[PDB]
Amino acid sequence: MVEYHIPSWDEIEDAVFSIGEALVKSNYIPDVLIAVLTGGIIPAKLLSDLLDLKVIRYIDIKFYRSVGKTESKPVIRSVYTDSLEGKKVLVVDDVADTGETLEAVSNVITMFNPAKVMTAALYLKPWSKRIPDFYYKQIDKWIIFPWDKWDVVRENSNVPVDKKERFLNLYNQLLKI
Amino acid sequence: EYHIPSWDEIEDAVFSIGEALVKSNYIPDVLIAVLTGGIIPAKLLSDLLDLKVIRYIDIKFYRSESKPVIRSVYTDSLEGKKVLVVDDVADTGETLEAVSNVITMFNPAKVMTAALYLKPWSKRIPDFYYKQIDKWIIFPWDKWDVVRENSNVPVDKKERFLNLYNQLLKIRK
Amino acid sequence: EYHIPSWDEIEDAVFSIGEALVKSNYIPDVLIAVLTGGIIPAKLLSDLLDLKVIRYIDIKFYRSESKPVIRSVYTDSLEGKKVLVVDDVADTGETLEAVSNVITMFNPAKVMTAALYLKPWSKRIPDFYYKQIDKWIIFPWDKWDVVRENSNVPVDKKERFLNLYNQLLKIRK
Amino acid sequence: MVEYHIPSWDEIEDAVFSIGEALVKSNYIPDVLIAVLTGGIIPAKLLSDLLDLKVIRYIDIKFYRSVGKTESKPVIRSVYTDSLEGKKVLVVDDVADTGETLEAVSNVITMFNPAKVMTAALYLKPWSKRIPDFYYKQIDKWIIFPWDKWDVVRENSNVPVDKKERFLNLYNQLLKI
Numbered sequence: 001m002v003e004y005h006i007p008s009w010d011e012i013e014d015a016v017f018s019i020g021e022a023l024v025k026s027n028y029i030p031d032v033l034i035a036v037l038t039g040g041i042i043p044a045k046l047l048s049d050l051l052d053l054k055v056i057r058y059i060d061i062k063f064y065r066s067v068g069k070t071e072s073k074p075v076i077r078s079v080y081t082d083s084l085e086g087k088k089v090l091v092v093d094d095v096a097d098t099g100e101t102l103e104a105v106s107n108v109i110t111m112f113n114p115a116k117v118m119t120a121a122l123y124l125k126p127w128s129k130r131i132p133d134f135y136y137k138q139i140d141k142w143i144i145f146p147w148d149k150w151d152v153v154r155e156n157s158n159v160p161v162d163k164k165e166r167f168l169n170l171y172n173q174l175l176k177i
Numbered sequence: 178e179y180h181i182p183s184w185d186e187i188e189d190a191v192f193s194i195g196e197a198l199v200k201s202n203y204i205p206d207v208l209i210a211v212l213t214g215g216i217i218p219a220k221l222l223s224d225l226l227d228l229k230v231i232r233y234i235d236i237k238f239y240r241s242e243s244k245p246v247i248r249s250v251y252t253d254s255l256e257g258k259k260v261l262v263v264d265d266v267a268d269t270g271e272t273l274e275a276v277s278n279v280i281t282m283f284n285p286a287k288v289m290t291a292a293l294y295l296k297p298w299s300k301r302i303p304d305f306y307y308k309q310i311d312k313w314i315i316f317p318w319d320k321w322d323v324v325r326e327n328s329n330v331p332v333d334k335k336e337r338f339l340n341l342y343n344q345l346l347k348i349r350k
Numbered sequence: 351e352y353h354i355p356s357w358d359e360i361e362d363a364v365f366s367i368g369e370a371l372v373k374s375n376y377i378p379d380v381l382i383a384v385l386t387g388g389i390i391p392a393k394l395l396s397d398l399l400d401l402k403v404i405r406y407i408d409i410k411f412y413r414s415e416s417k418p419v420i421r422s423v424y425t426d427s428l429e430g431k432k433v434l435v436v437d438d439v440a441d442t443g444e445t446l447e448a449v450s451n452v453i454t455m456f457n458p459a460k461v462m463t464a465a466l467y468l469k470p471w472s473k474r475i476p477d478f479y480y481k482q483i484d485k486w487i488i489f490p491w492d493k494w495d496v497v498r499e500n501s502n503v504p505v506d507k508k509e510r511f512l513n514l515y516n517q518l519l520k521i522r523k
Numbered sequence: 524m525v526e527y528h529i530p531s532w533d534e535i536e537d538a539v540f541s542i543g544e545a546l547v548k549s550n551y552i553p554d555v556l557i558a559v560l561t562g563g564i565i566p567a568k569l570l571s572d573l574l575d576l577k578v579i580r581y582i583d584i585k586f587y588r589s590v591g592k593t594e595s596k597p598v599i600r601s602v603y604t605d606s607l608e609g610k611k612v613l614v615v616d617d618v619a620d621t622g623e624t625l626e627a628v629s630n631v632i633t634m635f636n637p638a639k640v641m642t643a644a645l646y647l648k649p650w651s652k653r654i655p656d657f658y659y660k661q662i663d664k665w666i667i668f669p670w671d672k673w674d675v676v677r678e679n680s681n682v683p684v685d686k687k688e689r690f691l692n693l694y695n696q697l698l699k700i
């Protein structure tokens with residue numbers, strides 16, 4: 001499809017393996033993962049299991065780009081971590097588009113005085129203002145992840161995703177309350 | 178001896194629970210993900226049902242007579258809200274019990290629980306679950322922890338992992 | 351009918367508790383301040399005893415059959431630590447009980463409690479306190495909340511406050 | 524004293540009244556107070572009671588300037604707040620010296636996209652890089668607050684503070700364990 005990239009779970013595992021493999025090549029084994037909620041949740045958990053990283057923390061930050069709510073920049077809603085001083089930190093997200101979210105998170109994490117902050121995203125857009133330190137693939141269309149496919153379907157009746165009928169039947173019932 | 182759900186099955190597990198919540202007419206205001214096994218289930222359930230508020234509790238259970246230990250609770254007020262606690266497996270049931278007990282202290286309008294899978298000997302049954310299973314469940318999100326314990330478990334992509342793990346052993350720490 | 355401690359008395363209350371902790375040989379690893387009445391006592395106690403780790407719990411009790419309601423818990427791991435929960439007054443004792451109960455879920459090595467003042471009818475007695483008092487205590491940190499309730503309470507600087515409060519009523523909201 | 528300012532509790536109350544009075548003059552009634560832990564704790568609580576402000580949140584941030592630990596800039600250890608979007612926020616600290624702490628906190632709070640962020644400190648030093656939006660007095664010596672007087676005494680056997688003998692007897696016992 002020209003307008004969407006719809007990766008399978010197998011591609012997501014390949015993406016996470018690739019990040020892990022790159023981390024080991026660079027000898028950057030993080031002390032702490034910072035998952036960018038909520039798109040970075042699954043990537044961070046999978047990477048954590050892959051590399052036996054026992055410490056995951058979280059930042060709730062969102063780039064509002066919808067009909068109901070539109071903003072110019074990412075907005076932090078909360079930061080879920082204690083001291084990161086002297087730690088090697090890796091920020092993990094599912095995709096860097098403009099790169100503003102990773103920049104915002106990097107900036108705020110740097111205020112915790114870690115030993116090092118680096119960034120990882122599964123996917124990168126050509127127009128991103130900064131290349132993440134670690135990434136799996138550059139792609140120039142909108143990515144539909146397995147964990148936000150139904151949000152896309154809700155906003156877009158056209159898109160072809162697996163299990164759509166089962167979802168529509170459920171969504172239908174939700175809409176009637 | 179082992180149950181190793183595909184991502185396809187995990188999706189069906191989440192669909193199952195989402196359908197039960199809808200059929201039973203319980204639509205959560207807030208999901209509490211039990212870290213870290215519950216975070217992928219919670220995320221998938223949030224997407225399916227369009228639940229915009231996910232909060233988290235860092236809790237651990239060192240099985241061998243232990244009790245669950247809370248390390249942190251990441252949430253603000255839950256008062257007056259319908260909460261669904263979400264975890265990946267209910268084995269002893271201690272974790273869900275502990276989480277429900279602390280969430281109740283936030284005076285929500287209701288707390289219910291959900292886990293993808295349930296063990297026969299669980300002291301408490303989740304309000305919502307996909308399947309009860311006798312075998313040891315290897316999740317897509319903890320398959321390498323299991324392999325690092327026993328290398329001979331029959332999971333896919335094990336060679337790619339062992340390749341990586343080998344290098345990892347040399348550079349850490 | 352009223353007890354209105356000076357800052358001098360508050361200091362002596364904190365000294366009293368600090369001396370009791372030292373005499374009794376319990377030196378906390380972590381203070382849990384019960385927000386918001388406990389935060390000034392906790393800060394003063396932290397300075398006296400050189401306690402560098404203060405954490406917090408946002409909890410409220412709407413007296414008229416209610417229960418304390420937790421709004422958030424601000425702490426990471428307490429496991430293996432000696433904790434002292436700190437509040438300004440123990441009236442019904444429900445708040446301290448609730449806080450102790452949730453902190454125990456973090457598996458600390460010990461939780462003890464402290465409040466500056468104690469009411470005769472408290473269901474639970476703080477492990478450390480300064481004085482039991484029958485009167486309604488007006489703290490230096492909630493004197494204006496009391497005045498806003500009843501203007502005729504005998505606190506100092508009330509005219510400066512009413513002057514300010516009057517302007518405040520006009521511009522809010 | 525040329526080297527220390529040691530305010531009484533009555534002066535602290537005067538300071539908090541003055542901030543409150545200035546807030547009302549400016550018609551800036553905050554929705555949320557951000558207390559800068561731990562020096563801003565007492566000022567924020569007193570201001571909260573004074574102006575009936577029911578929402579107080581917290582940031583744990585420290586400027587290490589001691590023998591045991593020295594740093595160039597403030598370091599955030601944790602941020603205790605949920606969404607501040609669209610709120611009028613007032614950052615409250617006990618003193619602005621270099622002004623780096625208030626700057627750091629203002630910067631991070633601005634990432635939460637509040638309607639407005641302003642700052643208040645009881646005291647201001649002449650060499651501060653920015654004047655807080657609200658303050659009680661400018662002073663050019665080290666302030667010993669009622670809530671960190673014993674920390675000063677521990678680091679400095681000379682300073683004259685009330686109740687020192689009672690403290691030394693206690694400190695003595697602490698040191699022997």
Ligand SMILES: Nc1nc2c(ncn2[C@@H]2O[C@H](COP(=O)(O)O)[C@@H](O)[C@H]2O)c(=O)[nH]1
Nearest residue numbers: 039093095096097098099100101142143145
């Ligand atoms: N599903 C999906 N989410 C995206 C896409 N691009 C950006 N996002 C979301 O927006 C953030 C990145 O936006 P940025 O700040 O890089 O513009 C990420 O945290 C990600 O969750 C996309 O193509 N597909």
Ligand SMILES: Nc1nc2c(ncn2[C@@H]2O[C@H](COP(=O)(O)O)[C@@H](O)[C@H]2O)c(=O)[nH]1
Nearest residue numbers: 238266267268269270271272313314316319
């Ligand atoms: N991957 C996996 N972990 C399990 C399984 N059964 C129990 N556990 C772990 O063992 C504990 C069981 O106690 P409970 O989860 O009921 O508190 C939890 O820490 C849980 O993560 C299982 O079948 N598969």
Ligand SMILES: Nc1nc2c(ncn2[C@@H]2O[C@H](COP(=O)(O)O)[C@@H](O)[C@H]2O)c(=O)[nH]1
Nearest residue numbers: 411439440441442443444445486487489492
């Ligand atoms: N200022 C003040 N507040 C009190 C006094 N007694 C009770 N309260 C308030 O009433 C409640 C008493 O219940 P408890 O504190 O034991 O949970 C708390 O919310 C406490 O702050 C008092 O004597 N003075």
Ligand SMILES: Nc1nc2c(ncn2[C@@H]2O[C@H](COP(=O)(O)O)[C@@H](O)[C@H]2O)c(=O)[nH]1
Nearest residue numbers: 562616618619620621622623624665666668
């Ligand atoms: N006790 C005391 N603390 C100070 C003094 N100056 C700065 N501080 C502490 O350091 C911070 C301000 O430092 P700045 O970032 O403005 O250099 C405040 O949060 C305050 O707690 C002082 O003169 N006396």
Ligand SMILES: [Mg+2]
Nearest residue numbers: 037038039040
């Ligand atoms: Mg995102």
Ligand SMILES: [Mg+2]
Nearest residue numbers: 038039148151
């Ligand atoms: Mg998104």
Ligand SMILES: [Mg+2]
Nearest residue numbers: 212213214215
């Ligand atoms: Mg778990």
Ligand SMILES: [Mg+2]
Nearest residue numbers: 385386387388
């Ligand atoms: Mg209280």
Ligand SMILES: [Mg+2]
Nearest residue numbers: 560561562563
């Ligand atoms: Mg300070």
Ligand SMILES: [Mg+2]
Nearest residue numbers: 561562671674
């Ligand atoms: Mg200081």
